[PDB]
Design an enzyme around this catalytic site. Structure first.
Site, PDB file in Angstrom:
ATOM      1  N   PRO A  55       0.833  -1.209   0.000  1.00  0.00           N
ATOM      2  CG  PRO A  55      -0.397  -1.389   1.964  1.00  0.00           C
ATOM      3  CD  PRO A  55       0.831  -1.902   1.299  1.00  0.00           C
ATOM      4  N   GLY A  57       2.438   4.869   1.053  1.00  0.00           N
ATOM      5  CA  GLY A  57       2.796   5.424   2.340  1.00  0.00           C
ATOM      6  C   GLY A  57       3.580   4.503   3.247  1.00  0.00           C
ATOM      7  N   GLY A  59       6.617   3.534   2.661  1.00  0.00           N
ATOM      8  CA  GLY A  59       8.028   3.831   2.527  1.00  0.00           C
ATOM      9  C   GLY A  59       8.829   2.846   1.710  1.00  0.00           C
ATOM     10  CE  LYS A  60       5.201   0.687  -2.295  1.00  0.00           C
ATOM     11  NZ  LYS A  60       3.871   0.258  -2.807  1.00  0.00           N
ATOM     12  CB  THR A  61      10.435   5.583  -2.383  1.00  0.00           C
ATOM     13  OG1 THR A  61       9.327   5.284  -3.242  1.00  0.00           O
ATOM     14  CG2 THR A  61      11.494   6.340  -3.165  1.00  0.00           C
ATOM     15  CD  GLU A 276     -25.207   6.474  17.175  1.00  0.00           C
ATOM     16  OE1 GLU A 276     -24.206   5.731  17.128  1.00  0.00           O
ATOM     17  OE2 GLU A 276     -26.163   6.372  16.379  1.00  0.00           O
ATOM     18  CG  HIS A 284     -20.632  -0.106  28.263  1.00  0.00           C
ATOM     19  ND1 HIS A 284     -19.917   0.601  29.206  1.00  0.00           N
ATOM     20  CD2 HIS A 284     -20.076   0.195  27.066  1.00  0.00           C
ATOM     21  CE1 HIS A 284     -18.971   1.301  28.604  1.00  0.00           C
ATOM     22  NE2 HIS A 284     -19.046   1.072  27.306  1.00  0.00           N
ATOM     23  CG  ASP A 358     -28.238   3.340   7.907  1.00  0.00           C
ATOM     24  OD1 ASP A 358     -28.239   2.762   6.801  1.00  0.00           O
ATOM     25  OD2 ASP A 358     -28.272   4.583   8.024  1.00  0.00           O
TER      26      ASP A 358
END
Lengths: 498, 308, 45, 48
Positions: A55, A57, A59-61, A276, A284, A358
């Site tokens: 993916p 970001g 840091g492959k470079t 919510e 809980h 939903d």
């Protein structure tokens, strides 16, 4: 073509964190770049090219730059999209020139970033396509013509391995395929330490908590988090990044920034609060009574943030509990999903609203995955069905990633022939859904003072914490009368100071 | 050379159409407006105190709230020259990478005359989020936005130029362009409140039509009738009120053309002192009485409670 | 860079001529066809 | 073709006829009381 010939790239393996498996694998290439004669005397043929897939970001470079810096060799970095032009044949000439320049300065490391732009598959689902094909053929010819003893190492970085040409994946062109996974909690902790070493930090900031609480975050995302927190501290005129600045940056990246007084009426807000608070209270209570292996409600907010009018932050459990999802755990999660509509039914009587449909969707799908895809009950079924509606796993909305994902069938669906088993499955699903809904309504109706008190407290404060909900549950045992809550001077007041 | 033809179009703003003291829905962020103005009138003052000056200000809202007029009022309070660069010259759709040189020339010529304002309207059309365009509209846009990012990240070089850009929605702008340092201030202008609407509408009543008809109108009802509008519509309300009030009577067309043409032709010769003579003031009154064009209170009351 | 010059010169001559024989009534059939140069011309006009 | 039947071509003919007499150039007066009211009534009687 300014391929930057830097004697020191400025990046070593000390600057790479959390990619430890790939670093250990690429230490072999670093050693080969250090003493190629040691590989030569053993008859060892080094790989012609290495594919760094993963993916963005991660840091492959940065990993390739670290390899080049540790090896002390010339590093020729270039992007694949720079090989794609309008004039046909320029990209092949650039490929030949780059390979010739690398062969002049041996040993060397060539790096091609975003190689999927050149190696796009000829999908069967202008002259640019012909130019891309010619450049890819030139790259294949150059890679096939490499002698292993010349000490030139080729690296290709990619974000989409599916788009890559399988010709490049053949042996002799990309011998090693290393997957750069997102960093773990320890890796994210190390990356956060590295990025916080560059900015003035306060001692109250605990990087371990933010490393553990942000799964899937790349090193670039952590750097952006640190930079945004520094920007917030500048905005708040703080001399150093406080823990409040970290929390504000985290909330800005996750759920977005807070708006300015954009509020609807009291009718459309109490309903979201009821949903919510009912979901959090059900979770809980299931944690408290039956010791369910479910998540924990961290905090609940009803202030609009980004594009969400309300949110329930849920603490993500460890991944080892995300594989062997048993039947009681799935039933308890179904109860948690139905808890919103249960709260609307026990609080607002028989006049429910859309804000709880939903969740009512997800449960109505989840029980199906209990009966058809997983085949957990024991009248055995003959075929599964695909989800008609697909919803991406995401933030503060409910987890629905207990088995990796909720709306992702593992290719276990078949078209039906008999239609009577379909209505039998529908009847069983309706029975299970009705039974679980009745159970969660019975559980929520036995605790009405705590639910109403939490609703009023959240409506007054506009935010609440999970420990506040736990304190409300402790101070309000089951079967207390409602007049105890209704006789208090201020229902929306909490005497607990965290 | 679009850059030079755009930079030919300086306009030293001194009198804005809608001043900042009259603009509505700005008191909630007027402190940032005044800070930006203070930076523009003296960029060296922000330079010496060392704090990060606002390099970029984005104004968002609905089409017609007066975002361009808000920018003009801010510049007039700042007394700095502005340039109106349109979206068309930025996206030179003939060669790949020409927008890079375009924006580089714009910033170079802005630094040569800074503090100035680079004013762009409809910023959402060209500098939106990456990836939405599919067919041959990615590389040029990526190069353009990369050059914008590398120009807004000037390393502590506070020349004094700011980017007054106009969008419609806050989501459509790229997230990399939303960060502070590149994009410092955000002004969200949605709709005026009732009493600000009343004050702006009364000012429009004072500055546009006959003053003698201002008192007869119950402006509270009018303000309750124009809630979803914007200050330019609050200014053009009295025009429509007079039109719809004159609509009530039964009158023909051709006589109005005749009198309009006569007053158009013979206003070029008449002396001004004869134009403002009291004899001329009492000429108009019985001209109106003879034509039966006496506009009354009840006509406009039925008009204002007749509209929506 | 030659087609752009031809189109710009052509449209500027059209507008200058329309100014020259003022008053004039300009009819523009099928505006759904409109490319960037004429859009800029009409916005500026 | 009675008068009521078509308002669109009627409005177009009004636009052309006002265009004929150079009557956009005297766009508005801002005068004391009379010319403004006459031009207001004319502006109304164009559109409706």
């Amino acid at each position: 073509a300014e391929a930057r010939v830097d004697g020191s790239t400025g990046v070593k393996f000390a600057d790479v964190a959390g990619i430890d498996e790939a670093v250990d694998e690429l230490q072999e290439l670093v050693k080969y770049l250090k003493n190629p004669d040691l590989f030569d005397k053993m008859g060892i043929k080094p790989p012609h090219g290495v594919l760094l897939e993963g993916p963005p970001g991660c840091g492959k470079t940065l990993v390739a730059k670290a390899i080049a810096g540790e090896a002390g060799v010339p590093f020729y970095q270039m992007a694949g999209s720079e090989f794609v032009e309008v004039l046909v044949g320029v990209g092949s000439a650039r490929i030949r020139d780059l390979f010739k320049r690398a062969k002049v300065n041996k040993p060397s490391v060539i790096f091609i970033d975003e190689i999927d732009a050149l190696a796009t598959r000829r999908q069967g689902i202008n002259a640019a396509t012909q130019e891309r094909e010619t450049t890819l053929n030139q790259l294949l010819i150059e890679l096939d013509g490499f002698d292993t003893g010349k000490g030139v190492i080729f690296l290709g970085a990619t974000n989409r391995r599916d788009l890559l040409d399988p010709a490049l994946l053949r042996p002799g062109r990309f011998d090693r395929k290393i997957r750069v996974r997102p960093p773990n909690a320890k890796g994210r902790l190390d990356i956060l330490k590295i990025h916080a070493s560059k900015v003035k930090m306060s001692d109250s900031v605990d990087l371990s908590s933010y490393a553990s609480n942000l799964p899937g975050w790349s090193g670039a995302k952590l750097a952006q988090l640190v930079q945004e927190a520094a920007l917030v501290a500048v905005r708040k005129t703080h001399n150093s990044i406080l823990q409040s600045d970290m929390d504000d940056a985290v909330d800005r990246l996750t759920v977005g920034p807070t708006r300015i007084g954009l509020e609807l009426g009291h009718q459309g807000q109490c309903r979201r609060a009821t949903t919510e608070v009912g979901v959090a209270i059900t979770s809980h209570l299931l944690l408290r009574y039956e010791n369910a292996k479910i998540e924990r409600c961290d905090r609940v907010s009803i202030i609009p943030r980004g594009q969400t009018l309300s949110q329930v932050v849920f603490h993500r459990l460890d991944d080892e509990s995300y594989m062997f999802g048993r039947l009681p755990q799935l039933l308890h999660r179904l109860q948690v999903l139905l808890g919103g509509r249960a709260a609307e039914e026990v609080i607002y009587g028989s006049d429910t609203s859309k804000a709880s449909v939903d969740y009512l969707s997800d449960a109505s799908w989840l029980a199906r995955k209990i009966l058809t895809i997983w085949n957990l009950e024991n009248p055995m079924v003959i075929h599964g069905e695909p989800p008609p509606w697909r919803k991406r796993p995401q933030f503060v909305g409910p987890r629905l990633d207990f088995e990796g994902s909720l709306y992702d069938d593992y290719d276990l669906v078949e078209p039906p022939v008999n239609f009577n088993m379909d209505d039998e499955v529908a009847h069983r699903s309706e029975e299970l859904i009705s039974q679980m809904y009745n159970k969660t309504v019975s559980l929520l109706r036995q605790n009405q003072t705590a639910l109403l008190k939490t609703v009023k407290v959240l409506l007054n404060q506009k935010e609440i914490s999970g420990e506040a909900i736990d304190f409300i549950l402790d101070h309000y045992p089951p079967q207390t009368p409602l007049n105890s809550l209704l006789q208090e001077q201020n229902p929306g007041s909490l005497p607990f100071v965290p | 050379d679009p850059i030079k033809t755009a930079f030919d179009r300086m306009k030293r703003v001194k009198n804005p159409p809608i001043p900042l003291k009259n603009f509505a829905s700005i008191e909630s962020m007027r402190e940032e407006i005044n800070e930006v103005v203070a930076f523009l009138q003296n960029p060296k003052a922000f330079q010496e105190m060392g704090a990060r000056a606002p390099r970029g200000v984005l104004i968002v809202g609905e089409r017609g709230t007066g975002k361009t007029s808000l920018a003009l009022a801010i510049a007039a309070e700042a007394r700095v020259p502005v340039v109106n660069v349109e979206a068309q010259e930025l996206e030179a759709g003939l060669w790949v990478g020409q927008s890079a040189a375009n924006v580089r020339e714009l910033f170079q010529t802005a630094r040569d005359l800074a503090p100035v304002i680079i004013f762009v309207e409809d910023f959402d059309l060209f500098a939106g989020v990456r990836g939405k365009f599919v067919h041959t509209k990615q590389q040029d846009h990526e190069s353009f936005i990369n050059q914008l990012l590398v120009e807004l990240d000037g390393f502590e070089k506070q020349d004094g130029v700011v980017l007054m850009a106009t969008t419609r929605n806050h989501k459509q702008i790229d997230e990399a362009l939303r960060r502070p340092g590149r994009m410092d201030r955000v002004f969200h202008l949605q709709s005026p409140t009732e009493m600000e609407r009343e004050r702006i509408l009364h000012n429009a009543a004072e500055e546009t039509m006959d003053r003698e008809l201002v008192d007869l109108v119950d402006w509270r009802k009018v303000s309750e009738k124009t809630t979803l509008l914007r200050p330019i519509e609050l200014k053009l309300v009295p025009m429509a009120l007079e039109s719809s009030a004159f609509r009530s009577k039964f009158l023909d067309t051709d006589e109005l053309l005749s009198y309009v043409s006569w007053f158009a032709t013979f206003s070029h010769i008449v002396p001004p002192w004869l134009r403002k003579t009291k004899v001329a003031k009492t000429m108009g009154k019985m001209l109106v009485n003879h034509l039966g064009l006496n506009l009354t209170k009840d006509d406009l009351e039925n008009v204002v409670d007749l509209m929506e | 860079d030659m087609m752009l010059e031809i189109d710009r010169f052509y449209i500027t001559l059209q507008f200058e001529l329309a100014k020259a024989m003022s008053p004039c009534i300009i009819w523009i059939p099928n505006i759904h066809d409109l490319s960037y140069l004429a859009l800029g011309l009409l916005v500026n006009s | 073709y009675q008068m009521i039947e078509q308002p669109g071509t009627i409005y177009l003919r009004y636009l052309v006829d006002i265009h004929k007499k150079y009557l956009m150039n005297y766009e508005f007066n801002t005068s004391c009381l009379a010319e403004r009211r006459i031009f207001l009534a004319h502006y109304q009687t164009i559109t409706y």
